[PDB]
């Protein structure tokens, strides 16, 4: 997998070139904004259980067919698998947030997930709706101005939202 630094390095190696001063400047900016990135990861991680649970509860209230007898999330084993999937996607989104790059989320989570769901009969459109709910809740948790030094995390939040949208699009 790549992080923001490995991405620039691997492209430079492909061309056999030293990093330019502009690329080094941009990577120095990533480091300078690293404290904000760690906050986002810690806040999302620290609220993982409620992000998953509230998003799942809202999903089932909107889509009652999922939890009726015969529904895909009926029985406790399938309900737990569903909750686990919500948590896995959130987990990999926090991974990508720490990395500043979507590669871990694409390679180890999203790649092949649509076909897995297809074979199982898991409704991926409903998973994507659950992911969007986790996105809104996680963004609001990251954006909460209480108990943190005031500043601009708009670029970070947009990056995080892009990882959520990526996960949703992979299964929608």
């Amino acid at each position: 997998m790549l992080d923001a630094f490995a991405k620039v390095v691997s492209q430079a190696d492909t061309k056999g070139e030293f990093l330019s001063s502009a690329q080094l400047d941009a990577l120095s900016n990533v480091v300078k904004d690293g404290s904000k990135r760690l906050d986002a990861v810690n806040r999302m991680t620290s609220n993982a259980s409620t992000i998953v649970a509230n998003a799942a509860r809202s999903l089932f209230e909107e889509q009652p067919q999922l939890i009726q007898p015969g529904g895909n999330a009926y029985t406790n084993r399938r309900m737990a698998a569903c909750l686990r999937d919500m948590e896995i996607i959130l987990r990999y989104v926090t991974y990508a947030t720490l990395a500043g790059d979507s590669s871990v989320l694409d390679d180890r989570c999203l790649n092949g997930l649509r076909e897995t769901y297809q074979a199982l009969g898991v409704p991926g459109g409903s998973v994507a709706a659950g992911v969007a709910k986790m996105k809104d809740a996680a963004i609001a948790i990251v954006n909460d101005p209480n108990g943190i030094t005031k500043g601009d995390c708009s670029a970070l939040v947009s990056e995080i939202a892009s990882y959520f949208d990526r996960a949703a699009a992979a299964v929608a």
């Binding site: 630094f5 720490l98 180890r108």
Partner: protein, 162 residues
């Protein structure tokens, strides 16, 4: 690619966990060290051609037979001298990659993996490259923790050749 960040993620992914505070402190440790690492990477990049030429010459003067003996593995012609300067450039360039990435990942993946097999197969002496690395250590002109970072990855490459 292995970096302090991807290593932290890989550890958490192995145990199926979210990232821990230990891992977040590990990554901030990389962020704090990054200032020294980037200052070393910039200086090595800016003086790259002078360090490469001086390292090649340092090898040629420690091992004069490398410019006199006949053979594809030696630098007695323009082909061999170009191969050698190219190799030394590879070492320096990938060292700056490691400094930028904050770990040995680029050196491990791009250079060290398979290094012993290549030096054996093509009859290249590891001592030649150790001497070039010792020149780079002695002439990069860095000070403070920037020098500590450069010397750490130079010593890492030297150990891989020893």
């Amino acid at each position: 690619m292995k970096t302090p960040i991807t290593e932290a993620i890989a550890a958490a992914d192995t145990q199926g966990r979210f990232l821990s505070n230990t891992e977040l402190q590990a990554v901030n440790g990389r962020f704090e060290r990054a200032a020294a690492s980037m200052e070393a990477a910039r200086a090595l990049t800016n003086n790259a051609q002078q360090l490469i030429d001086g390292a090649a010459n340092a090898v040629y003067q420690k091992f004069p037979y490398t410019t006199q003996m006949q053979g594809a593995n030696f630098a007695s012609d323009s082909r061999g001298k170009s191969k050698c300067a190219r190799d030394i450039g590879y070492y320096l360039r990938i060292i700056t990659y490691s400094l930028v990435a904050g770990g040995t990942g680029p050196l491990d993946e791009y250079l060290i993996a398979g290094l012993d097999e290549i030096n054996r197969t093509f009859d290249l002496s590891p001592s030649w490259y150790v001497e070039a690395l010792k020149y780079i250590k002695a002439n990069h002109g860095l000070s403070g923790q920037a020098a500590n970072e450069a010397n750490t990855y130079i010593d890492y490459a030297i150990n891989a050749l020893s």
